[PDB]
């Protein structure tokens, strides 16, 4: 199983973004998954009771797509990742640097989803404004943010991270417990991840995944104490040879 060290030495943020999040003419399977992810996140953050002051995103990588609807419902956002170069790629975009990844097509799509009450540049400004901190994190640690003093979060978000970070089910359960240390009683856990995937690719670079069915995900989350408020299966697959996933899931849990 892919180690933490392999992420540091092999994960190329710009390549990752180009292959999965360009929302262009190529990578059509990847485009379809992204549309569905954005639809589910819109419903989770804009149509429900998932709102509050502070949201902490765990394992953000170099991406912001998972935060676009969230910033309508949360005033403060903290993003975090294990991999230093991912955080720097994120910063390129936050600081509006030349050469930052083009998120426009994604931003436009979310604006469309939210009824066009807002144009692209306004949405991008609002997200930049909401993101308060960009921090190192390690989900495998009892104190995932290195024990920095932060208020307990109203929402804990993690997309496409836990399957990649956990070599087996005991490790997956431990990571779930670890994340809970950051969340208020009554707070929301929002999770997205691949189903039944044992790997994903960034070009030639292969990264491990823990293959889990939706029932197994449900049980692990429920055994961690969460009341599952929402759970959806996304029945789309990544491109052949890109992953062996059979769909993805999204879920909303509430901490007792
Ligand atoms: N032990 C760990 N703790 C926190 N993050 C980890 C981790 N091991 C791997 N990761 C991160 O998990 C991410 C998987 S790529 C997922 C990126 C983004 N959240 C998206 O939805 O596309 C990588 O950015 C990697 O750095
Ligand atoms: C697009 O990024 C990803 C795709 C599939 C993954 C998996 N666990 O199969 C993980 N992952 C980060």
What structural category arises from helix and sheet content? alpha/beta
Helix content: 25-40%
Termini, distance in Å?
33 Å
Q: Which CATH-level-2 architecture?
A: 3-Layer(aba) Sandwich
Overall domain count: 1
- Shape from CA axes? globular
Measured by DSSP, the beta-strand proportion falls in 15-25%
N-to-C SSE string, H for helix and E for strand: HHHEEHHHEEHHEEEHEE
CATH superfamily label:
Vaccinia Virus protein VP39
* CATH class designation: Alpha Beta
PDB class: transferase
Keywords: nnmt, NA, MNA, T2D, transferase
Assembly: monomeric
Entry title: Co-crystal structure of Mouse Nicotinamide N-methyltransferase (NNMT) with small molecule analog of Nicotinamide
Describe this structure in words.
The protein has one domain: 3-Layer(aba) Sandwich (Rossmann fold). It is globular and about 40 Å long. Strands 3-2-1-4-5-9-8 form a 7-stranded mixed sheet, sandwiched between helices. Strands 6-7 form a two-stranded antiparallel ribbon. The chain contains 9 helices and 9 strands. It has 256 residues and is of the alpha/beta class. The two termini are 33 Å apart. The site of 6-methoxy-1-methyl-2H-pyridine-3-carboxamide has 10 residues, from helix 7. S-adenosyl-L-homocysteine is lined by residues 4, 7, 59-61, 63, 66, 81-83, 86, 137-140, 159-161, 164-165.
List the helices and strands and how they pair.
Layout: H1 4-10, H2 13-20, H3 28-46, E1 52-58, E2 74-81, H4 84-94, H5 104-113, H6 120-130, E3 131-136, E4 153-159, H7 162-165, H8 169-180, E5 183-194, E6 199-202, E7 205-208, H9 214-223, E8 227-234, E9 248-254
Parallel strand pairs: 1-2, 1-4, 2-3, 4-5
Antiparallel strand pairs: 5-9, 6-7, 8-9
The protein binds S-adenosyl-L-homocysteine and 6-methoxy-1-methyl-2H-pyridine-3-carboxamide (8WO).
GO molecular function: nicotinamide N-methyltransferase activity
Catalytic activity: nicotinamide + S-adenosyl-L-methionine = 1-methylnicotinamide + S-adenosyl-L-homocysteine
Subcellular location: Cytoplasm
